[PDB]
């Protein structure tokens, strides 16, 4: 007797599945919050060079003449390109000549200015303090935020790999609960460190544990149900992320100091760890290893939950042993990576599939972590990304049946791509339309992820199917690391980052219909 018959006589759609779906989807919201917090915990508020005559009340008490604050600001700080005071320069000697309008204040050499040797002054209109304010990553080290985000994503990658191996060797629920605890502890410790490298290291560990819990949640959610309702489980696991975006919006609107926000986001994972003990472990994996009694215990439990004790009373050890004998082998795992490239018919089916996976990690994270520039109100913008995602996410599954197979993937990438290209041409005065085009861009990229998981399976044969979706996972992560690093090239122009981020999916999507 095979395992599906046992899962059939125990219950696949019973209430137990609903309870487990709720209890495992709820933490996905907070995982999304931890992943997206870098948009609010490290914002860049306005800044100007520290001034002796403006800031120090000692010199403020000795000022000859009661001039307006705008006058003093014009005297101390040269103007900038946006008619605002310059952000990294200061007049070395108070220039009183600038007051007279008879002299056109335009011939100022950089030799008359000096770098800010007395710190900076930030505005506290909407943010009380962020790490940009705390450690002054401005005007010389402004390239240290993409470094932090790249470190976070590298942490996700390494943690995913290590936790995958460990969960294959140890179990699902064990690695799940220990990853919960690791997220909680590492977040708590990261919310109090005094210097920057320690903050980076503990963000690394947080991301590793988050990758672990995400993968194990996916596996456990898919495994304990029948093959009929799998895609519904994947759909719920996808909706978790959008609801997490909305939660991030609300929570960030709540708290404005990066330490308290970080603690509030990292707290409830201990509560999740505290109740992760009552969930029954996966029985199929236990059958694979060979601990039959444990599997029978878990099966009797889950059957007793669904009010199906009578039929499960017949379960015995020998039928589980025969099921183990019917379990397939994974010895061939070594040569699957080779034959994916060796056979010509399978070479091209991969080189296109990865560019579908790589284009998502590169375009999404390169923008969704820079919501400061693509609009004005961050709290409302962060919320709309999650709200719009659901209509597109539900609509895309409808479009599958009507427009066909090949035309689904190609369509769900050109549309998010062309909106980013149109961002530069739209005049800077029309701020409303510039923001609305950004939301539809980042929002529609949610359904782009849902489709590639579905189309990954039907392309490759079932023998090597697990391997192909595996490599698609690495190219998606390995591309995310190169996401934020692109924003370094903004020094050449403010439009160039918006050019690279949108051309990649269009060149990916239009090339995906060739399958
Ligand atoms: C899962 C990752 C590593 S990305 C990621 C990293 C950290 N935390 C959440 C996500 C994430 C994954 C799939 C999503 C989808 N759809 C999604 C949607 C919104 C927000 C986050 C994600 C990937 O590249 O596969």
Task: Explain what this protein looks like in three dimensions.
- The protein is mostly helical and 515 residues long.
- The chain folds into three domains: 1-42 and 133-327, Growth Hormone, Chain: A (Up-down Bundle), CATH 1.20.1250.20; 47-122, no CATH class; 333-515, MFS general substrate transporter like domains (Growth Hormone, Chain: A), CATH 1.20.1250.20.
- Helices cover 65% and strands 2% of the residues.
- It contains 22 helices and four strands.
- The chain has helices at 3-10, 15-36, 57-60, 69-76, 131-135, 145-170, 173-190, 196-223, 230-254, 258-266, 269-275, 283-289, 292-305, 309-312, 317-325, 336-342, 344-368, 378-403, 406-425, 431-459, 465-481, 496-512; strands at 47-49, 90-91, 113-114, 120-122.
- Strands 1-4 form a two-stranded antiparallel ribbon. It has a two-stranded antiparallel sheet with strand order 2-3.
- The chain is elongated, with a radius of gyration of 28 Å.
- The chain binds verinurad.
- Verinurad binds next to helix 2, helix 9, helix 20 and helix 21.
- Verinurad binds at residues 32, 35, 156, 238, 241, 361, 446, 449, 476-477, 480.
Quick tags:
monomer, 515 residues, mainly alpha, Growth Hormone, Chain: A, 3 domains, two-stranded antiparallel ribbon, two-stranded antiparallel sheet, 22 helices, binds verinurad, urate transmembrane transporter activity, MFS_trans_sf, glycoprotein
């Amino acid at each position: 007797m095979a395992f599906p018959e046992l899962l059939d006589r125990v219950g696949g759609r019973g209430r137990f599945q609903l309870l487990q779906a709720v209890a495992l989807v709820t933490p996905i919201l907070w995982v999304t919050t931890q992943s997206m917090l870098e948009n609010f915990s490290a914002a860049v508020p306005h800044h100007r060079c520290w001034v002796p005559l403006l800031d120090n009340s000692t010199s403020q008490a000795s000022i000859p003449g009661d001039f307006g604050r705008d006058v003093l600001l014009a005297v101390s700080i040269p103007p900038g390109p946006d008619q605002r005071p310059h952000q990294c320069l200061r007049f070395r000697q108070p220039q009183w000549q600038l007051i007279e309008s008879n002299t056109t204040a335009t011939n100022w050499s950089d030799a008359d200015t000096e770098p800010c040797e007395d710190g900076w002054v930030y505005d506290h209109s909407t943010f009380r303090s962020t790490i940009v304010t705390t450690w002054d990553l401005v005007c010389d080290s402004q390239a240290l935020r993409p470094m932090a985000q790249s470190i976070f994503l590298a942490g996700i990658l390494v943690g995913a790999a290590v936790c995958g191996h460990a969960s294959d060797r140890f179990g699902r629920r064990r690695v799940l609960t220990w990853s919960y605890l690791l997220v909680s502890v590492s977040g708590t410790i990261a919310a109090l460190m005094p210097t920057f490298p320690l903050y980076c290291l503990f963000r690394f560990l947080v991301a590793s544990a988050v990758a672990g819990v995400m993968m194990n949640t996916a596996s456990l959610l898919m495994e304990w149900t029948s093959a009929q309702a799998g895609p519904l489980m994947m759909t719920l696991n996808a909706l978790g992320f959008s609801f997490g975006q909305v939660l991030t919006g609300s929570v960030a609107y709540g708290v404005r100091s990066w330490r308290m926000l970080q603690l509030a986001v990292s707290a409830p994972f201990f509560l999740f760890f505290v109740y992760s003990w009552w969930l029954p472990e996966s029985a199929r994996w236990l059958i694979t290893v060979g601990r039959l009694d444990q599997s029978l215990r878990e099966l009797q439990r889950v059957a007793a939950v669904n009010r199906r004790k009578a039929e499960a009373d017949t379960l015995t050890v020998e039928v589980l042993r025969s099921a183990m004998q019917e379990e397939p082998n994974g010895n061939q795992a070594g040569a699957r990576l080779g034959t994916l490239l060796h056979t010509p018919g399978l070479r091209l089916r991969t080189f296109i599939s990865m560019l579908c996976w790589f284009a998502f990690g590169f375009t999404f994270f390169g923008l969704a972590l820079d919501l400061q520039a693509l609009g004005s109100n961050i709290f409302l913008l962060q919320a709309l990304i999650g709200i719009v995602d659901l209509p597109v996410k539900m609509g895309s599954l409808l479009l599958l049946s009507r427009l066909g197979r090949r035309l689904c993937q190609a369509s769900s990438l050109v549309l998010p791509g062309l909106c980013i290209l149109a961002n530069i041409l739209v005049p800077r005065e029309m701020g409303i339309l510039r923001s609305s085009l950004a939301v539809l861009g980042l929002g529609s990229l949610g359904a782009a992820f849902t489709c590639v998981t579905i189309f990954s399976s039907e392309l490759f044969p079932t023998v090597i199917r697990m391997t192909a979706v595996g490599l698609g996972q690495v190219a998606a992560r390995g591309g995310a690391i190169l996401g934020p690093l692109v924003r370094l090239l903004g020094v050449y122009g403010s439009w160039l980052p918006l050019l690279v981020y949108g051309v990649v999916p269009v060149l990916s999507g239009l090339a995906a219909l060739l399958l």
